Amino acid sequence: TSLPTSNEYQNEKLANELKSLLDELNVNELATGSLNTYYKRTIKISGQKAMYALKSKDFKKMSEAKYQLQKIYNEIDEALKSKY
C-alpha cells in the first residue's frame, strides 16, 4: 500500500489519541472514589462523551471530547496531589 489522504491521516490520529485516553479511563473513574462528588459526577459524563464520540468517527465530537476528558483527567491529578 501507499500513504493515507489528509482527512485520512488527521482522522486516524485524533481517534488513536482519543482511544489512548479511553484506555486508562477506568483507572481514573476509580480514583474519583476518594475525591469530592464533583469529580465523579464529572468524569462519568465525560467518559460517555468520549466512547460515543470515538465510535462516531466524526472529527468534532472526537476532539471536543478528546479535550473534555483531558481536562478532568488532570482535574484529578491536581486533586490527588493536595492529599499525598
Q: Is 41 in the site for another protein (CB under 8 A)?
A: yes
- Kindly indicate which of the ranges 4-12, 13-21, 74-82 contains the residues binding another protein, using the contact rule CB under 8 A: 74-82
CA dihedral 24, 27, 29, 33 (to 10 degrees): -170
Q: What is the C-alpha separation between 18 and 71, in angstroms, rounded?
A: 13
Shortest distance, position 11 Cβ to another protein, whole Å: 20
Cβ-contact 53, 72 below 8 angstroms:
no
Ranges within 7-36 binding another protein (CB under 8 A): 36
Among 12, 19, 34, 44, interactor with another protein by CB under 8 A: 44
